[PDB]
Design an enzyme around this catalytic site. Structure first.
Site, PDB file in Angstrom:
ATOM      1  N   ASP A  35       0.731  -1.203  -0.091  1.00 56.34           N
ATOM      2  CA  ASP A  35       0.151  -0.276  -0.054  1.00 56.34           C
ATOM      3  C   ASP A  35       0.703   1.157   0.054  1.00 56.34           C
ATOM      4  OD1 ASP A  35      -1.844   1.945   0.150  1.00 56.34           O
ATOM      5  OD2 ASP A  35      -2.670   1.346   2.264  1.00 56.34           O
ATOM      6  N   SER A 199      -0.415  15.622 -12.161  1.00 50.06           N
ATOM      7  CA  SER A 199      -0.726  15.253 -13.431  1.00 50.06           C
ATOM      8  C   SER A 199      -0.900  16.338 -14.332  1.00 50.06           C
ATOM      9  CB  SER A 199      -1.837  14.207 -13.534  1.00 50.06           C
ATOM     10  OG  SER A 199      -2.133  13.898 -14.758  1.00 50.06           O
TER      11      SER A 199
HETATM   12  O1  LIG Z   1      -6.496   5.115   2.018  1.00 51.69           O
HETATM   13  C1  LIG Z   1      -5.523   5.145   1.025  1.00 51.69           C
HETATM   14  C2  LIG Z   1      -4.851   3.984   0.982  1.00 51.69           C
HETATM   15  C3  LIG Z   1      -5.521   2.668   1.122  1.00 51.69           C
HETATM   16  C4  LIG Z   1      -6.844   2.423   1.108  1.00 51.69           C
HETATM   17  N1  LIG Z   1      -7.252   1.138   1.514  1.00 51.69           N
HETATM   18  C5  LIG Z   1      -8.268   0.439   1.495  1.00 51.69           C
HETATM   19  C6  LIG Z   1      -8.121  -0.781   1.856  1.00 51.69           C
HETATM   20  C7  LIG Z   1      -7.017  -1.564   2.193  1.00 51.69           C
HETATM   21  C8  LIG Z   1      -6.015  -0.805   2.179  1.00 51.69           C
HETATM   22  C9  LIG Z   1      -6.052   0.480   1.849  1.00 51.69           C
HETATM   23  N2  LIG Z   1      -4.895   1.642   1.760  1.00 51.69           N
HETATM   24  N3  LIG Z   1      -5.376   6.075   0.376  1.00 51.69           N
HETATM   25  C10 LIG Z   1      -6.039   7.421   0.626  1.00 51.69           C
HETATM   26  C11 LIG Z   1      -7.542   7.595   0.667  1.00 51.69           C
HETATM   27  C12 LIG Z   1      -8.005   8.510   0.911  1.00 51.69           C
HETATM   28  C13 LIG Z   1      -7.311   9.675   1.202  1.00 51.69           C
HETATM   29  C14 LIG Z   1      -6.067   9.777   1.222  1.00 51.69           C
HETATM   30  C15 LIG Z   1      -5.339   8.344   0.952  1.00 51.69           C
END
Ligand SMILES: O=C(Cc1cn2ccccc2n1)Nc1ccccc1
Length: 330
Positions: A35, A199
Site C-alpha cells: 500500500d 498530473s
Molecule cells: O487510504 C488510502 C490507501 C488505502 C486504502 N485502502 C483500503 C483498503 C485496504 C488498504 C488501503 N489502503 N489512500 C487514501 C485515501 C483517501 C485519502 C488519502 C489517501
C-alpha cells in the site's frame, strides 16, 4: 541487495493485489496488500480478536525465535474506505522476494474492522508511503522500504500491477524489460506523507487532451481512480446511459457498454488506461448496471491515482533524498 515478488489480484475484478511476505524464524508466509497510500506493516495474528478472523493466515510471534515485543508500543489506523485496525507491535525479520530486513516493526492486529474480516484473501498490509505517516506510538516506526533502503542496490521500488493477471513488485532495481519506451519522472511532495504528484492533464477516448494540473497521490492501496468532478463528468458523458447514482455511491453504467479509454498526463508523456480497465462489473450479482472505475474525488479532499491508473503503467517509486515518481507505458 534486491528483492522481487509477484503480486496477484485477489479476485476477478482486481479489487486489490496480494504479495507473499515471509515473517519471523522459521518463516511464516502471509499475503499482504502492498500500500503506497499508508505506512504501517500490520498483520492478522494470534492476537487478533477471534471473531474478527475468518480465513486469513495469521502471524504467531510466539512461534518466531526472532520476534521481540516492542515494549509499550501501540498503533491504530484508518483508511479511505472507512476501514480500520489497531494493536501492538513486535520487531521481527521480514523478507520480500529474497530481500530481508531484520528488526522490522510488525504491527500485530488486536482489532480489525468488518471489511478486513470479510476479505479472506488479505492477511494484512505492507505500507510503502513515507514513514512520517506511520501510526506507531509513542515511538514512530519505519517502513519496510525505509529500513531496506540503504542496503538496496538503488533506493527505489517499482510497481507493475497486472490487469486481470499477476504483476510484480521489485525492490532496489528497475527491470528495463518490464516497460516500453522511457520512464518519465515527476516531482513529489512529501508534505502529507504520500507519493503526491501533479498530473499534467487528461483525455477521454480519442478526444483532445486537456492541459490542466491535477494534484493527487500514487496509491496502490486504493482500487479506483478518483479525480475532480469536472474530469469525471467529462469521462462518463461519453458513455450512453452512464449516471452518477447517489444510492450506489458513484457513477454506474450499462454493463452492455463498451467503455472509452482514459489518458492521464505525466509531464509531456501520456498513460492510456484501456476502457475495459474501468469496468468493475455488476453493482450487485445479476445486475445489468455496472460500477465505474473512475469516480469523483469531491469530498475526499485529495485526488487518487489508484490501481485503475497505476496498472496501466510501470511505476517507479524513487526514494532518493529528494523522492520522485516515474511512469512508463508497458
Ligand atoms: O487510504 C488510502 C490507501 C488505502 C486504502 N485502502 C483500503 C483498503 C485496504 C488498504 C488501503 N489502503 N489512500 C487514501 C485515501 C483517501 C485519502 C488519502 C489517501
Amino acid at each position: 541487495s534486491t528483492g522481487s515478488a509477484t503480486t496477484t489480484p485477489i479476485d476477478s475484478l482486481d479489487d486489490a493485489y496480494i504479495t507473499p511476505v515471509q515473517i519471523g524464524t522459521p518463516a511464516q508466509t502471509l499475503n499482504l496488500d502492498f500500500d503506497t497510500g499508508s505506512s504501517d506493516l500490520w498483520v492478522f495474528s494470534s492476537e487478533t480478536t477471534a471473531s474478527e478472523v475468518d480465513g486469513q493466515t495469521i502471524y504467531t510471534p510466539s512461534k518466531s525465535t526472532t520476534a521481540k515485543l516492542l515494549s509499550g508500543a501501540t498503533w491504530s489506523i484508518s483508511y479511505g474506505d472507512g476501514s480500520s485496525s489497531s494493536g501492538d507491535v513486535y520487531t521481527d525479520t521480514v523478507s520480500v522476494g529474497g530481500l530481508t530486513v531484520t528488526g522490522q516493526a510488525v504491527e500485530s492486529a488486536k482489532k480489525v474492522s468488518s471489511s478486513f474480516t470479510e476479505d479472506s484473501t488479505i492477511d494484512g498490509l505492507l505500507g510503502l508511503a513515507f514513514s512520517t505517516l506511520n501510526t506507531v506510538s509513542p515511538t514512530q516506526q519505519k517502513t519496510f522500504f525505509d529500513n531496506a533502503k540503504a542496503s538496496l542496490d538503488s533506493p527505489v521500488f517499482t510497481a507493475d500491477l497486472g490487469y486481470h493477471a499477476p504483476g510484480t513488485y521489485n525492490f532496489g532495481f528497475i527491470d528495463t524489460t518490464a516497460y516500453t519506451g522511457s520512464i518519465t519522472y515527476t516531482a513529489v511532495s512529501t508534505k502529507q506523507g504520500f507519493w503526491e504528484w501533479t498530473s499534467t492533464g487528461y483525455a477521454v477516448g480519442s478526444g483532445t487532451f486537456k492541459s490542466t494540473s491535477i494534484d493527487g497521490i500514487a496509491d496502490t492501496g486504493t482500487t479506483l481512480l478518483y479525480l475532480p468532478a469536472t474530469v469525471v463528468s467529462a469521462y462518463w458523458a461519453q458513455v450512453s446511459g452512464a449516471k452518477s447514482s447517489s444510492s450506489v455511491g458513484g457513477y454506474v453504467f450499462p454493463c452492455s457498454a463498451t467503455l472509452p479509454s482514459f489518458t492521464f498526463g505525466v509531464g509531456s508523456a501520456r498513460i492510456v488506461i484501456p476502457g475495459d480497465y474501468i469496468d468493475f462489473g455488476p453493482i450487485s450479482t445479476g445486475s445489468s448496471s455496472c460500477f465505474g472505475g473512475i469516480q469523483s474525488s469531491a469530498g475526499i479532499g485529495i485526488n487518487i491515482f489508484g490501481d485503475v491508473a497505476l496498472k496501466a503503467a510501470f511505476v517507479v517509486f524513487n526514494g532518493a533524498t529528494t523522492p520522485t515518481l516515474g511512469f512508463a507505458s508497458k
